């Protein structure tokens, strides 16, 4: 996290979101710096797993 920013320099990080975690994404990342009020980056969402099994259909599927 400790990172010196050069003047007139933009540093674009790569926010990689994984596939493992709680089903509810309740995150509050804080970008705290001296002489500046806290600028918290809040990430919210949900984690889900998809059903990737092809079911046999010799018997009719009932909806």
């Amino acid at each position: 996290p400790p990172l010196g920013f050069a003047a007139l320099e933009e540093r674009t990080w790569t926010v990689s979101i994984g596939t493992d975690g709680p089903p509810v994404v309740n995150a509050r990342i804080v970008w705290r710096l001296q002489g500046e009020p806290n600028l918290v980056l809040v990430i919210t969402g949900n984690r889900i797993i998809a059903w990737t099994f092809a079911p046999d259909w010799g018997d009719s599927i009932v909806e």
Partner: protein, 82 residues
Amino acid sequence: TYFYGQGEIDAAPIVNGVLGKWRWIQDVSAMSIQLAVEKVEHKESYSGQKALVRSFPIGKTATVNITLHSIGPDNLALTLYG
């Protein structure tokens, strides 16, 4: 690359898993071996043709039939559970 077989058959009784002494079963007229396999089939429906797409075997068995014309006491014991 063609088969028309004649010959001899020998058997060894198995007791408690230890090999016995082999003996001739005397004249034999017919021997056949049959294989049976049970399969469970998987199908896919994307084509609309409702046809088979995969099959994997589940059962595996084999049976042997033997026709012997010998009424010798040893063969009688083998066949009559005697």
